[PDB]
Design a protein around this ligand. Structure first.
Ligand SMILES: [Mg+2]
Lengths: 165, 368, 344, 255, 63
DNA sequence: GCTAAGCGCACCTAATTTCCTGACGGCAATCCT
RNA sequence: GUGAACCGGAUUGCCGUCAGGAAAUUAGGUGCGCUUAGCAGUAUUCCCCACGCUGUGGG
């Protein structure tokens, strides 16, 4: 989809200081700090004007902050419930595995403006296991499409089929 | 004449009600998960509230023979009480039996401890149990009982034990989407060891939510249940209002001391019950300005204005009192000037609703 | 000229009860019985209980018909407690009733043309409320939806009418059953081994007397003799569209028009203006009229967008034309000067 | 001529109708499981009620020993997939003993659903069994509207005080009896920006936007809370914000 | 609490203690339903005590 | 009246253990003698 | 009006009650934004109204 791949490319082309000012902006909105809003305008407004399929404001802001925090490379076929879910096969099935499973289970019951913290702990579990690649494009178009039930359905049984291999 | 209480109560992270697996009660409302508090939990907390000791008058126990034996310093009578109860219909130490406490004490002592016949003594005990419906908690919560017709003798007849409930309590549903949270607890061993491991590891489950609480009292049915003594009915209504405002369910309160007080109470007087939970069909999302109680009160005021400008009767005006501590949260912030008597004191609110009920003051009715 | 009349029977629930039910267990048949469709037509004409009896049954009953089952609805049992007495006493009558859930039927009655025309006219004008066998089952689709036509046999009539998809991606039955009154063929011709008995020929209707009839089923295959239809509508609601663009030609004309009566001046600080801001997004994309647009300068449009992003402003954005929303706009505009690098 | 009333009513979590095993009554529609309120439940809830009790009225509306009552109701099919839930209760012994717990220690069933409720009246037969009393028939139709607007099924309500009001009523005077249950062959999926009742009313609006393309309609929402059709299109003849003026407009249309 | 205090020596004493004597348990957490936003001329602790005092006065007057 | 090129790094390591509760409470009528 | 019409599954209820995730840890090693410039020594100053066309009512 156009408008999202170039968003991921521009996020990946961001330099270290820009990622730092995005990192400090994590945990709050963008109305209290200027350079966060200037950066969101610079990375959104021309790409919003150029394409009709630009992502929604808050999901784009969430993915920008999470990419600044974690910095995983973009790679096709590396979405969240595959990588976590293959991670969920190497744990103790009676105690630890239900706890990490509930950590991933929490994600299905948030709106878009508190969603970054359970995602942050999930991506921290990913970082603790040396995971370098994530389908950032896949994550953001399934996150912008969060209003429907079938998308969460295919999310979930993708986790299931990653678990049963 | 229906008295309607709509309360908005924000709670600290707590687990007031739990299911089999120790999870907070959740229900689907408007297509989304909502934190739920059971109506039976609220009814128990109201009945066991500190504003109810002078008004509590009912016991719902299966150990009735224990109660009857307890009024006997030396008169050992427990097997005969159990036998007369077993022939009364209970099959065992029995099924659950609800009636008054002074009634069971005095009347069962003077009936079953008497050396007399056996079947008609069981009939007398059954009449005493069925007719003992003069307790305002029994009048509010309601009761009917059916004994086992197999173990009961054919010579024992039971009168009508159906007490119609004058109180309807809804399950307290959250105004926003449910947020189930997990608390990872350990239990440290107080003696040291060579391993340094906890004595027990577990996961508690808790949730913090803004609950909408709904109560409905039927005044005609309440004065029919408690008979003509309307002073006790006014005392029951005032004790209910004070207990509902000032008591929380006793869940895991030792570990989650969440004793927050409600920020908004609407007491409305109308002949038809209204559920304002449809105000919160759309979940309440937080914003930068205002808070959750303010947003929920605004949504509730929007729906109250819509209902009054919608379902309205000229023959029966709708009228209600709005509560906020020292007028902290107004109801109609923008346009809905419907609450005529925004009241900033609980005793003033109780006095106002008692005056609308009739010529009753709170001090005068606190004697029955 | 049209010798066939068509009935469309679709609802949330339906129940055409069989012969083995007037006890407390009151089951249903898989297909609409002849007495059921005959009663539906009798209500559509609107004659009395005994007016059906007085020479009205065999005129509608010699019409050898077929019933075409589009999709098989499942059998749902409802737990019905009749109150009996609520002369009266506390006794509760117990019952379980069978319903067909999510099934669609087409009934083709073949007869002489004038009866078919009268039946279609009465179907368009039901003088009494008609339903799907039980009064608590009103139809979800019009019974007079499919127009009548002329067909030689029942098979041609039942294969001519298409099968209507309710939505775009639903599983359709590859095989489609059809149940018809048994055509005797030539004189004589005792019924074949597959001919089943069915007590659904009405001859009196109060009390109901039913006569047996011979019932035979064929199978139709969709895609060669029964063809699907179009969707002819939308299913989901999908509320209206936000996210007005900023490159279409209809945008710039309204944006430049709003910069005229405002004299290229800002509205909160009265600086020279260079852009425009929206007050509500009830109309957007290209449809914009110049009464909900505010001409704003560069340094305050950015402040406005900084303030409306996460305030839950939904549709009605910040107006610079009311005192309530203004006093914090200046407090915001204090610090966009403070921290922005002027150096695209 | 037929008066058709399509009511959308969102009920708070409760159990209004119970089957043999205590579950909420359940039907099957749109290829998914729906919550159901039986027709006779709504019939008896509307009947025997002082809200409605205030030749013989209400014998013609709901029959009693060949009356063929003018008013009948459909089973309340939910607009979405049913969500039945277990509630676990205990009943305390409230006498200090060596153990704890005394009651049934059982489980009840409850569900919250947005019901589409269909009502149909024939006017001509309602006049016919009223012996030509047209004014009495108009008054009893207004009484039906008043009652069914504010009467709920008096099922298990002492423990589940569900007294919600309908958020939308569509009244038409069309030719053939049609139910809009086919509007909700789609179960209503909830989005973040819209609620369940708004989406259900929108599905109804998008379905009455059809049929006319290939009669009139009075739309009632409390103080125009939910407008039928979020446009200026000629889809609802009169957007009405109050129930009393809705009843007045319907009555003055009829007579 | 002694949780990672060797790496985070956070031994800060309370900035305000309200000890009340009453029959029923009440709590002032609902004061902080609205999160405290820090302004330049005031303090987080000062604003926290101010909001607590507002709710305490409201509860005392209305309850 | 307001310029323009060229230039923007990658390598190393990412951890271990052990503990994870028990007993108690589970209803009855009334729907052909 | 069609195995159909008339037709609730009714009410009685706290899951509750015990608990520190705990102890351990440098983000380091490398770095020029930089090369050009009168806010003014004039030759059409963009003009609407007006002088025999160089004064005059100002956008
Ligand atoms: Mg400005």
């Amino acid at each position: 989809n156009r408008g999202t791949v170039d968003f991921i490319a521009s996020l990946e082309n961001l330099k270290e200081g820009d990622l730092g000012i995005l990192r400090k902006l994590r945990g709050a909105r963008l109305d209290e700090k200027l350079p966060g809003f200037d950066l969101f305008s610079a990375l959104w407004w021309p790409l919003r004007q150029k394409n009709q399929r630009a992502p929604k404001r808050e999901v784009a802001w969430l993915i920008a902050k999470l990419f600044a925090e974690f910095r995983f490379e973009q790679r096709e076929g590396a979405t969240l419930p595959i990588l976590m879910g293959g991670i969920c096969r190497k744990l103790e099935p009676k105690k630890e595995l239900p706890r990490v499973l509930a950590r991933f289970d929490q994600l299905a019951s948030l709106d878009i403006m508190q969603m970054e913290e359970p995602l942050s702990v999930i991506m921290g579990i990913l970082r603790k296991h040396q995971q370098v690649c994530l389908d950032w494009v896949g994550l953001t178009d399934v996150l912008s499409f969060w209003e429907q039930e079938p998308v969460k359905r295919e999310w979930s049984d993708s986790f299931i089929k990653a678990y049963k291999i | 004449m229906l008295i309607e209480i709509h309360m908005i109560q924000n709670h600290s992270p707590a687990n007031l009600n739990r299911d089999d697996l120790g999870a907070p009660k959740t229900c689907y409302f408007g297509g989304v998960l909502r934190s739920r508090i059971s109506s039976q939990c609220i009814k128990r907390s109201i009945r066991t509230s500190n504003d109810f000791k002078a008004l509590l008058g009912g016991v719902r126990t299966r150990r009735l023979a224990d109660l009857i034996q307890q009024e006997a310093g030396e008169t050992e009578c427990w097997k005969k009480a159990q036998e007369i109860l077993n022939k009364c219909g209970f099959k065992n130490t029995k099924m659950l039996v609800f009636m008054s406490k002074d009634k069971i004490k005095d009347l069962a002592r003077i009936v079953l401890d008497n050396s007399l016949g056996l079947t008609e003594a069981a009939q007398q005990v059954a009449n005493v149990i069925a007719q003992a419906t003069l307790a305002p908690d029994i009048a509010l919560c309601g009761r009917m009982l059916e004994p086992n017709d197999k173990d009961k003798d054919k010579k024992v007849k039971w009168s009508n034990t159906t007490v119609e409930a004058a109180l309807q309590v809804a399950h307290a549903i959250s105004t926003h989407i449910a947020r189930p949270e997990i608390d990872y607890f350990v239990a440290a061993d107080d003696v040291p060891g060579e391993d340094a491991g906890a004595g027990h590891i577990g996961e508690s489950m808790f949730a913090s939510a803004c609950f909408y609480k709904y109560f409905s009292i039927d005044w005609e049915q309440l004065v029919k249940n408690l008979k003509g003594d309307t002073n006790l009915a006014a005392h029951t209504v005032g004790a209910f209002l004070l207990a509902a405002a000032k008591t929380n369910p006793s869940g895991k309160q030792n570990s989650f001391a969440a004793h927050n007080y409600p920020d908004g109470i609407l007491v409305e007087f109308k002949n038809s019950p209204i559920s304002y939970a449809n105000a919160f069909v759309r979940p309440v999302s937080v914003v930068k300005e205002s808070d959750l109680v303010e947003q929920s009160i605004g949504q509730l005021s929007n729906y109250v204005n819509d209902i009054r400008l919608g379902y309205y009767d000229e023959q029966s005006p709708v009228i209600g009192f709005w509560f906020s501590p020292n007028n902290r949260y107004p109801l109609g912030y923008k346009h809905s000037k419907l609450a005529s008597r925004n009241i900033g004191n609980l005793n003033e609110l109780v006095g106002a609703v008692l005056d609308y009920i009739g010529g009753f003051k709170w001090e005068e009715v606190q004697k029955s | 000229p049209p010798n066939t009349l068509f009935l469309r029977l679709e609802g949330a629930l339906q129940s055409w009860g069989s012969n083995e039910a007037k006890f407390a267990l009151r089951r249903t048949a898989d297909a609409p019985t002849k007495s059921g469709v005959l009663g539906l037509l009798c209500a559509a004409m609107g004659i009395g209980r005994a007016e059906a009896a007085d020479s009205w049954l065999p005129k509608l009953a010699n019409l050898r018909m077929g019933v075409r089952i589009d999709r098989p609805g499942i059998r749902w049992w409802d737990f019905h407690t009749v109150g009996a007495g609520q002369k009266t006493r506390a006794e509760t009558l117990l019952s379980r009733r069978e319903y067909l859930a999510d099934a669609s039927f087409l009934v083709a009655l073949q007869g002489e043309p004038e009866l078919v025309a009268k039946l279609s006219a009465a179907l368009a004008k039901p003088v009494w409320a008609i339903y799907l066998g039980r009064k608590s089952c009103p139809p979800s689709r019009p019974v007079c939806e499919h127009p009548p036509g002329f067909y030689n046999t029942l098979e041609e009539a039942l294969s001519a009418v298409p099968l209507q998809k309710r939505w775009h991606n639903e599983p359709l039955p590859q095989i489609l059953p059809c149940v018809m009154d048994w055509i005797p063929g030539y004189d004589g011709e005792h019924a074949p081994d597959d001919a089943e008995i069915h007590y659904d020929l009405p001859v009196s209707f109060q009390p109901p007397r039913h006569l047996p009839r011979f019932v035979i089923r064929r199978e139709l295959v969709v895609g060669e003799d029964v063809q699907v239809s179009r969707e002819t509508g939308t299913s989901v609601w999908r509320p209206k569209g936000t996210r007005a663009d900023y490159n279409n030609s209809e945008y710039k004309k309204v944006r430049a028009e709003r910069l005229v009566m405002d004299h290229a001046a800002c509205m909160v600080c009265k600086a020279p203006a260079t852009t425009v801001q929206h007050v509500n997004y009830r109309r957007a994309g290209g449809k914009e009229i110049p009464e909900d647009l505010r001409a704003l300068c560069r340094l305050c449009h950015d402040a406005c967008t900084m303030l409306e992003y996460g305030s839950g402003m939904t549709t009605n954005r910040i107006d610079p034309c009311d005192p309530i929303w203004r006093e914090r706009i200046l407090a915001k505009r204090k610090e966009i000067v403070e921290f922005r690098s002027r150096g695209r």
